[PDB]
Each structure stands twice: as C-alpha cells, then as structure tokens.
C-alpha cells in the first residue's frame, strides 16, 4: 500500500544488490510479491516473485543466479537481491504484489500484479 | 465475511446449514472445491438433486456441502465461437457415489461388445462441455466454487 | 506470449478521439489481458481490467477496445489526466506487461 | 424483472455529437446488462454484453461502458450508416431478456 | 421455413391450469429448446419458462418460480406450459419462439427467434 523500496541505489560493476521494500499496511504473510525491471525505456522487465507466506519464487532466466528474491519476513521489508550490476545493469525496479500467480501455491489466480513497491531506481553508474 | 459482501451470486443458498455462521463456527477445512461446469449440470450440483452430472459425474451428499456457491461465467469460459474447452463426463459409467474426488474417469459400459465394454470404440467420459454464450444458461460456461 | 504497445509516441492533442493498439500476439480472451496505467514514472495503477472495462478511477475520457492480437486501445478525447503512462498488461501466459504506448502533446 | 428501460430513451444525435445513452434499468444490473442495436431490415444485433466489451462485429463507434446503476453505451464516432435504435436487453442470469425502447441515434 | 405452430387462444380460469401447444411444423424441433414466451398483457414482457427437452432437465420462469410446471414434449410434436395454479396474472398472448437457444444448422436467417403465433389467456 506504500510498499516503502529504497532509491537511488550505488551498487557496482561486480556487487550485490538488497533492495528493500517495506511490506506496508497489509498482512504481509496472506500475500507474495512479485517484481517488474523498468529497464529505461523498456517497458518493465519481468523480474519474478516472492511468495510473502513461504517464499516461493519465479524468477527471470535473464536473472537466474543473478536476481535472488529474498524479504526480512520479521520487519516485513522485501529484499529483491540481484547481482550482476554494471552501468549497462543500472536499471530500475519495482515491487508488486503478485495476484496473478496468487501465493501460497505459486499457482495462477484472479487479479494482476498488485500494489506495487516505492520504486528502486538503481544507480549502478560508471 | 467476505462471503456475504459478493454481488449476486444466483446461488448462495447455502447447500448445509444456514447460510450465515460459517464465519462464526470454526470447522476444521471447508474443503473448497473448485471446477467448472455449465447450467445443466449446475442444476445437479446440490444435496440430493441427483441429475445429468450428479448422475454421471459431480455428486453431493445428504447435506453439508459446505455453503455451494454457483454463478453463471458467460463472458468467462465462453466465447461465441462457442468454446470447447472443458471436458466433463456424461456416459461416464453412472452415477458416482456422493461426494467423491473423481480424477477416476473411468470410461462407460456401453455394451456390444466385450473387450473394452465401449460400444463401438472410446465412449468418452471426455465431454468437451462444449456450450456457447447463445444457449441458456443450462448452457452458459459456469465457474462453480464448492464448500 | 507477447504484447506490443504500438503507438508509443501517439500525439494526439486533449479533446480528440485517438487509436493506441497494444497488439497482443495470441487470441487472448480478455477476462485475463488487463490494462494498468502508471505516472511517467511511478507504479502501475490498476488501468483497465478486462483491457477495455472501466472501472471506478477511470473517467469516461478514457477509450480502447481490441480481441485476438490487434488490441486498439481507441481512447476517445484527452487529457493530461490520460497522459500517464499505461501498460496493457496479460493476465494470460506468464504476464508479460506493456512498455510503450503513452499519449503525447504538442 | 428489473424489467428493462433505459434512461436516456431518445437521445438525438448525428454524427459524432459526443453521445450518452445509458440502459438505467429500474434498479441495479451489476455485470448482467445488455446494450442492444437494432440493423433496420434484418435481425437485431447484439453489440456489448455486461456494461462494455463488444461483440466481434459492430464496430467500436457503439461503445460500451458505465458501471453502476446505469451503464452507458457512448459512441465515440457515428458515421450516416449507424442509425440504429439502441433498446437494450438485459441478459438476466436465469432468461428473462427483457429489451429496450429505441434510442436511436440519427442524421439529419 | 419453419413455423413453429401453436395452439390456438382461450381463457383459462384461477387455481386450474392454462394448456398451450407450441406443435411441430415438419421436423426442426430437436435442438430448438421449447422455451415459453409469455408476453403480459399490455404492462410488459414475460418468458413462460418453457420445458429443456435436449437431454436434460427443464428451466423455469424466473417469473413465478415455482409452480411454472412447464413440460414439452417434441417427440410427440406438441409443446406445454402447463402452468399449474393460475389465477389471473395471465391475461396475455403467450407466444412459442425459438427463443435464444433454439438455432438450427439450417434456417439460420430465422435466427434464434423462430416465433410463434400467440394465446389469449385471461380469466
């Protein structure tokens, strides 16, 4: 509902990346949050998706070992972690919460991705 | 809660008990089921009513089928190319015994023959519940959730 | 299965009915394929359920229709409150949203 | 029934003529609401079903929408040939199809 | 090319039934659904209810809901109402149509709407 991420994120060419997102004023657990790559100008990237109840996860094949979705379940804040960042990688992201695969089951259901994070503008800038 | 606050179902006559309490009383699982059907067979998917599909295929028990909640998916599993999709069993054998789970879809007795009981050969118990948004709604697609 | 926001620069000025195809790729039936509309960078509202369905936030203004693979969201006259960025979204087949199709001005 | 009327019922308008006509029943219709035209010397068509989403066919001119009690089928542009009366049925979820009045919208 | 032939007009009295036929004309009944149209005297419209003799149970009138008994049976080339408990509300033209589900492969220019001819009920 806020889905509070970080900002202007100073990763590097060979770092890791932990995101936040602050899962906001929702029960956290009786939902997941999936994720979108707002490459500049490239639409939005399909990221993938953390289940909030037991993290189950679909990740983007671009990203396989790269984007590692993970979430401080206690202070309920999403960590989407990508490594592999560079100049060419420094591009944003958002949080959702992923209704269309609704969690608990990494199964299809009703709805889109939905309440969407704060917005992690990564910048990786060489 | 979250029931009560649907729009119009055109079934929530709760097939058990009243259709209030459920929020109240704490039962262990409701088991939810979920399939698709159209009209005709919604017409059998309730406590006794044993009918074409719940004398084939989806049967109900003496009562307590949850709180049964049907609605017609016009716009939802049919297309006026009048889909195809879903396949249920009509001629399945006969009428399963109330409340199974029958991903058993054992195929239909249909006699002159002996090898395979099917008559000629295949008789489906895989009924594309080929309908169409132009029938009725015995015929609409209907998404059906079961308690 | 894929989607194309065609007119990614549609200029068409406030006031006058415009066309802005999204294009899918597939026969989709549209109870999945959705549209969601995000500020020029901020995050996705809920746009167009039904991918040519208005629902509450969205005001009359606001036009599309489109089946199979040539969804034109043919909007009718502007405004900046249409001038967000909207990503029609797929509902269908691993969802693939939309990256282009904003109106322009002047 | 809710036993249809719409409310605009003669909307007057040539072409273009930023259009509203709207099925308002007697009460509410949720998702249940047909908005019909009828095709002079033929059968009726069916253009929109629950307060939008058109037909394949009958092009996106008669255009859908409005969620509430009533669901407003605008044209966004006519051209001469879309005289046709707009009555509307309403696809009741058990039969009921009760039709509509005739809101045509004209040419000079 | 089809008709649809119907039975005739005649009142009919409360608490008694209201008899109508909907009768074959030369085949073309089969899928053709014998639903019921009612259409109300001059207030409004209506939908008898009609018998599903395709392979299944039948729909009843939303309208009365209930005591709608109606029956058709298109083997022996005669529709039914069969409205049990009538009292007056009829007063109407009741019409036999191809209503909405009721197309045939052929005579697809008489579209789902294959009408009738209509009965005079009233007290």
């Known amino acids: 509902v806020q889905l509070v991420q970080s900002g202007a994120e100073v990763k590097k060419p060979g770092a890791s990346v932990k995101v936040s997102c602050k899962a906001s004023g929702y029960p956290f657990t009786s939902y997941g949050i999936s994720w979108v790559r707002q490459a500049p100008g490239q639409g939005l990237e399909w990221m993938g998706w953390i289940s909030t109840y037991n993290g189950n996860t679909n990740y983007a094949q671009k990203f396989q070992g790269r984007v590692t979705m993970t979430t401080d379940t206690s202070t309920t804040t999403g960590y989407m972690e990508l490594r592999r960042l560079r100049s060419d990688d420094t591009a944003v992201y958002y949080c959702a919460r992923d209704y269309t695969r609704g969690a608990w089951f990494g199964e299809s259901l009703i709805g889109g991705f939905d309440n969407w994070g704060q917005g992690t503008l990564v910048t990786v800038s060489s | 809660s979250v029931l009560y606050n649907f729009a119009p179902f055109f079934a929530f006559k709760c097939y058990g008990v009243s259709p209030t309490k459920l929020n109240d009383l704490c039962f262990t699982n409701v088991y939810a089921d979920s399939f698709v059907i159209k009209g005709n067979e919604v017409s059998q998917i309730a406590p006794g009513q044993t009918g074409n599909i719940a004398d084939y295929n989806y049967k109900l028990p003496d009562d307590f089928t949850g709180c049964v909640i049907a609605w017609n998916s016009n716009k939802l599993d049919s297309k006026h190319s009048g889909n195809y999709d879903y396949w249920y069993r009509l001629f399945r054998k006969s009428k399963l015994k109330p409340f199974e789970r029958d991903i058993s879809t054992e195929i239909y007795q249909a006699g002159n023959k002996p090898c395979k009981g099917k008559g000629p050969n295949c008789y489906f118990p895989l009924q594309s519940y080929g309908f169409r948004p132009t029938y009725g709604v015995g015929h609409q697609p209907y998404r059906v959730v079961v308690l | 299965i894929v989607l194309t926001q065609s007119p990614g620069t549609l200029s068409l000025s406030p006031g006058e009915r415009a066309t802005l195809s999204c294009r899918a790729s597939q026969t989709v039936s549209s109870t999945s394929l959705a549209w969601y509309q995000q500020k020029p960078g901020q995050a996705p509202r809920l746009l167009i359920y039904g991918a040519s369905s208005r629902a509450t936030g969205i005001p009359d203004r606001f036009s599309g229709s489109g089946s199979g693979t040539d969804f034109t969201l043919t909007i009718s006259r502007l405004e900046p409150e249409d001038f967000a960025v909207y990503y029609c979204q797929q509902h269908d087949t691993s969802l693939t949203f939309g990256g282009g199709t904003k109106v322009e001005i002047k | 029934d809710i036993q249809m009327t719409q409310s605009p019922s003669s909307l007057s308008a040539s072409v273009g003529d930023r259009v509203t006509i709207t099925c308002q029943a007697s009460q509410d219709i949720g998702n249940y609401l047909n908005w019909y035209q009828q095709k002079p010397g033929k059968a009726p068509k069916l253009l929109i079903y629950d307060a939008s989403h058109l037909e394949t066919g009958v092009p996106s001119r008669f255009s859908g929408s409005g969620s509430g009690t009533d669901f407003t089928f605008t044209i966004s542009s006519l051209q001469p040939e879309d005289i046709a009366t707009y009555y509307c049925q309403r696809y009741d979820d058990l039969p009921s199809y009760t039709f509509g009045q005739g809101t045509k919208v004209e040419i000079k | 090319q089809v008709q649809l032939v119907q039975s005739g007009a005649e009142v009919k009295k409360p608490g008694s039934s209201v008899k109508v036929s909907c009768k074959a004309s030369g085949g073309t009944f089969r899928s053709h659904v014998i639903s019921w149209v009612r259409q109300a005297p001059g207030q409004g419209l209506e939908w008898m209810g009609g018998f599903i003799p395709l392979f299944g149970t039948t729909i009843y009138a939303q309208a009365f809901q209930g005591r709608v008994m109606i029956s058709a049976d298109e083997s022996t080339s005669t529709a039914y109402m069969e409205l049990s408990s009538l009292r007056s509300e009829d007063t109407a033209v009741y019409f036999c149509?191809?209503?909405?589900?009721?197309?045939?492969?052929?005579?697809?220019?008489?579209?789902?709407?294959?009408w009738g001819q209509g009965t005079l009920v009233t007290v």
């Open positions: 149509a191809r209503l909405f589900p009721n197309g045939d492969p052929n005579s697809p220019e008489d579209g789902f709407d294959i």
